Design a protein around this ligand. Structure first.
Ligand SMILES: *[C@@H]1O[C@H](CO)[C@@H](O[C@@H]2O[C@H](CO)[C@@H](O)[C@H](O)[C@H]2NC(C)=O)[C@H](O)[C@H]1NC(C)=O
Ligand SMILES: *[C@@H]1O[C@H](CO)[C@@H](O[C@@H]2O[C@H](CO)[C@@H](O)[C@H](O)[C@H]2NC(C)=O)[C@H](O)[C@H]1NC(C)=O
Ligand SMILES: *[C@@H]1O[C@H](CO)[C@@H](O[C@@H]2O[C@H](CO)[C@@H](O)[C@H](O)[C@H]2NC(C)=O)[C@H](O)[C@H]1NC(C)=O
Ligand SMILES: *[C@@H]1O[C@H](CO)[C@@H](O[C@@H]2O[C@H](CO)[C@@H](O)[C@H](O)[C@H]2NC(C)=O)[C@H](O)[C@H]1NC(C)=O
Ligand SMILES: *[C@@H]1O[C@H](CO)[C@@H](O[C@@H]2O[C@H](CO)[C@@H](O)[C@H](O)[C@H]2NC(C)=O)[C@H](O)[C@H]1NC(C)=O
Ligand SMILES: *[C@@H]1O[C@H](CO)[C@@H](O[C@@H]2O[C@H](CO)[C@@H](O)[C@H](O)[C@H]2NC(C)=O)[C@H](O)[C@H]1NC(C)=O
Ligand SMILES: *[C@@H]1O[C@H](CO)[C@@H](O[C@@H]2O[C@H](CO)[C@@H](O)[C@H](O)[C@H]2NC(C)=O)[C@H](O)[C@H]1NC(C)=O
Ligand SMILES: CC(=O)N[C@@H]1[C@@H](O)[C@H](O)[C@@H](CO)O[C@H]1O
Ligand SMILES: *[C@@H]1O[C@H](CO)[C@@H](O)[C@H](O)[C@H]1NC(C)=O
Ligand SMILES: *[C@@H]1O[C@H](CO)[C@@H](O)[C@H](O)[C@H]1NC(C)=O
Ligand SMILES: *[C@@H]1O[C@H](CO)[C@@H](O)[C@H](O)[C@H]1NC(C)=O
Ligand SMILES: *[C@@H]1O[C@H](CO)[C@@H](O)[C@H](O)[C@H]1NC(C)=O
Lengths: 213, 115, 168, 49
């Protein structure tokens, strides 16, 4: 199952998007220098070469305002985008603690299925989590009952569910089919068989008497 | 106002095909200037509308996708998923008798370039 | 979305040519608004599309005494909402300024929420880790009491009281 | 919350409603989601030694 992971790789679009977004802001920031913003030219030396100071101060001030606005746009977006990568780094740090340094009961926080363990891998500007999960398979249907009556008393399972294979009843654990005989060491007693809806008759075996013959 | 709206081009990628269809958003197909289909979302040109429903391939919008399956390009209503009834009763249970171990990936960004 | 040309100039050729002296400001404006418009459909897929199958409840809507008819779809209403969802939905081209429709319609969201409801009533929490496994509801509630430190006999001897309290 | 309150039972305090979490049911809203949280709340305490 771990071997199949390489086949699925040989995905990381979330990591390429971070690179793309910054490359696009740097390519745009440079391109915005070739704009006249309504001035006679876009080059602060050419203005002087063909114009007197009284009027050149106005033309250069227009270009300065335009390019200063470019920097304000750039920095504002970097702050808004840095908050998003920071929120992602907080999620990755939280999973590093809760998925890798321990076992989590949080649903879907550490993969799909029942969390067993996770292994980290380093990626460029990111982290990859290999989530190992427990998935049940191949179910069968059974008849069940909440309790069993014996000697006029209600017996409830300590852990597990009562199942019937068609002719006999057993106790099983809830996550894997593994039947055992219903005994007095497997169950506990509480109340009488007059309050439980759906209680059924069966035999609960006491180990004491067949030891005493 | 004299009807206006954006124009978008739907393309499978030049490494798949060079065919394209165009949706004129909330534009009637009589006021735009083969396969012409009028939908409540605008005028769809270049795809045929079918009554079947498939898994989404090329997403157009408002529940409609296109695919290259049955080749030109088609417009169809997306399927939502498989259907399944649980065999519920008042005294029946289902318990697994076997299991598998699965491995899945999750990817998270942690940093940008410092400029 | 906003068309920058119709906002700034508004069908004027003298202004439209002047926009060419400012560079690629409209490119930034379209990408900034489009990049956050795509996320809005992703936001709704991640909340509701968490189930692979579209689960249905049995016609015999009756679960150990619990009455779920106010949260399940009611086959006699606009589209297909529960009686409670009807309260939730009933209580709540200028010059370029365009509003785009969502990808998922309200009918499609209702169908995701009704499938989640059917799964948790007939299958408990098993459909989220594999195949949906049926178990009777009274027995689901007994497991859920065990998970908080209450023994299971406390539910089974008081089943009628808990169903009356839930329904009210 | 959808995964941890509806598809399972949570032990996180106050995360899935006030009281001991038993179960949740989703409802749709025009631009959001409404959760119905079912909790267990003890009542009528007595004194003991
Ligand atoms: C249910 O399981 C039981 C136990 O396996 C089956 O009953 C027989 O039980 C006797 C002991 O009391 C064994 O010696 C037999 O070998 C069992 N037979 C079989 C076929 O396993 C019973 O048959 C099972 N019921 C059904 C409907 O399959
Ligand atoms: C589960 O439901 C079925 C009906 O779907 C119940 O079967 C009925 O049982 C009563 C007695 O309680 C009989 O008089 C009816 O004739 C049965 N109906 C059918 C169609 O056979 C069954 O009792 C229920 N189980 C529990 C534990 O309540
Ligand atoms: C389970 O076993 C008990 C004990 O044998 C049954 O209780 C008897 O019920 C019959 C009527 O069906 C009465 O006439 C007897 O007086 C009861 N016996 C006692 C000791 O109270 C019970 O009916 C059985 N349950 C089923 C479903 O057969
Ligand atoms: C549980 O599942 C595994 C397969 O995932 C079963 O193991 C296979 O059993 C067959 C014979 O039935 C062998 O030919 C294969 O070589 C086994 N596979 C492996 C990987 O060992 C296993 O037997 C199943 N358990 C039950 C009780 O059916
Ligand atoms: C579950 O509750 C609903 C109401 O939310 C019950 O429906 C009402 O039933 C009474 C009696 O037939 C009618 O007078 C009302 O008009 C019904 N309300 C609606 C909105 O139709 C329903 O009967 C309950 N289910 C059970 C099994 O008790
Ligand atoms: C536990 O408390 C509930 C109330 O929260 C009690 O149930 C109520 O009892 C009164 C008096 O008999 C009735 O008039 C009400 O109709 C009951 N309410 C409901 C919803 O059924 C219950 O009796 C208490 N349990 C004990 C053992 O005292
Ligand atoms: C348990 O006993 C204590 C006393 O040891 C009770 O405390 C009373 O609290 C009320 C206010 O709630 C005061 O007005 C009384 O003066 C207190 N009594 C005494 C004797 O100090 C407390 O109420 C008891 N708890 C319960 C649940 O009955
Ligand atoms: C009540 C119910 O759902 N019964 C189903 C039946 O419809 C289906 O044909 C069979 C095989 O898949 O499994 C069981
Ligand atoms: C269990 O029985 C139901 C019908 O009551 C059926 O739909 C389902 O497929 C059965 N499960 C298995 C594993 O056979
Ligand atoms: C893209 O083209 C290459 C060949 O240049 C081919 O190997 C690859 O499969 C193509 N990708 C798609 C998605 O068709
Ligand atoms: C387009 O106009 C025709 C009449 O010329 C009308 O029949 C049709 O319904 C219109 N389409 C839309 C989508 O309004
Ligand atoms: C699709 O079905 C409708 C009836 O539901 C029918 O009127 C329409 O002509 C069908 N479309 C096609 C392309 O056959």
């Amino acid at each position: 199952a771990i071997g199949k992971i390489q086949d699925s790789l040989s995905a990381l679009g979330k990591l390429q998007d971070v690179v793309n977004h910054n490359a696009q802001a740097l390519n745009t920031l440079v391109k915005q220098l070739s704009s006249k913003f309504g001035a006679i030219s876009s080059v602060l030396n050419d203005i002087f070469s063909r114009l007197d100071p009284p009027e050149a101060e106005v033309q250069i001030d227009r270009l300065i305002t335009g390019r200063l606005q470019s920097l304000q746009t750039y920095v504002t977006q970097q702050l808004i985008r840095a908050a998003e990568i920071r929120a992602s780094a907080n999620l990755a740090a939280t999973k590093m603690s809760e998925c890798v340094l321990g076992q989590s009961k949080r649903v879907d926080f550490c993969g799909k299925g029942y969390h067993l363990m996770s292994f980290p891998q380093s990626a460029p500007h990111g982290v990859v989590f290999l989530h190992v999960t427990y998935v049940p398979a191949q179910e069968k249907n059974f008849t069940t009952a909440p309790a069993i009556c014996h000697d006029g008393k209600a017996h409830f399972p300590r852990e597990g569910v009562f199942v019937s294979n068609g002719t006999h009843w057993f106790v099983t654990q809830r996550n894997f089919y593994e039947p055992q005989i219903i005994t007095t060491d497997n169950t506990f007693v509480s109340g009488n068989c007059d309050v439980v809806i759906g209680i059924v008759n069966n035999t609960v075996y006491d180990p004491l008497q067949p030891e005493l013959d | 106002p004299c009807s206006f709206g954006g124009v978008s081009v739907i393309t499978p990628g030049t490494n798949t095909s060079n065919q394209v269809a165009v949706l004129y958003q909330g534009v009637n197909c009589t006021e735009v200037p083969s396969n012409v289909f009028q939908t409540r979302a605008g005028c769809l040109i270049g795809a045929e509308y079918v009554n079947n429903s498939y898994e989404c391939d090329i997403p157009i919008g408002a529940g409609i996708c296109a695919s290259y399956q049955t080749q030109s390009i088609i417009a169809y209503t997306m399927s939502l998923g498989a259907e399944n009834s649980v065999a519920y009763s008042n005294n029946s249970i289902a318990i697994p008798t076997n299991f598998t171990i699965s491995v899945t990936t999750e990817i998270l960004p942690v940093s940008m370039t410092k400029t | 979305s906003v068309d920058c040309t119709m906002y700034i100039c508004g069908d004027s050729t003298e202004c439209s040519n002047l926009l060419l002296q400012y560079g690629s400001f409209c490119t930034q404006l379209k990408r900034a608004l489009t990049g956050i418009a795509v996320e809005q459909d992703k936001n709704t897929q991640e909340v509701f599309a968490q189930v692979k199958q579209i689960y249905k409840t049995p016609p015999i809507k009756y679960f150990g005494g619990f009455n779920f008819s106010q949260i399940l779809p009611d086959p006699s209403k606009p589209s297909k909402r529960s009686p409670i969802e009807d309260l939730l939905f009933n209580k709540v081209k200028f010059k370029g300024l365009t509003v785009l429709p969502p990808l998922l319609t309200d009918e499609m969201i209702a169908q995701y929420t009704s499938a989640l409801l059917a799964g948790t009533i007939t299958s408990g929490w098993t459909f989220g880790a594999g195949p949906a496994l049926q178990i009777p509801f009274p027995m689901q509630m007994a497991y859920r009491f065990n998970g908080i430190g209450v023994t299971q006999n406390v539910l089974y001897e008081n089943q009628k009281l808990i169903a009356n309290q839930f329904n009210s």
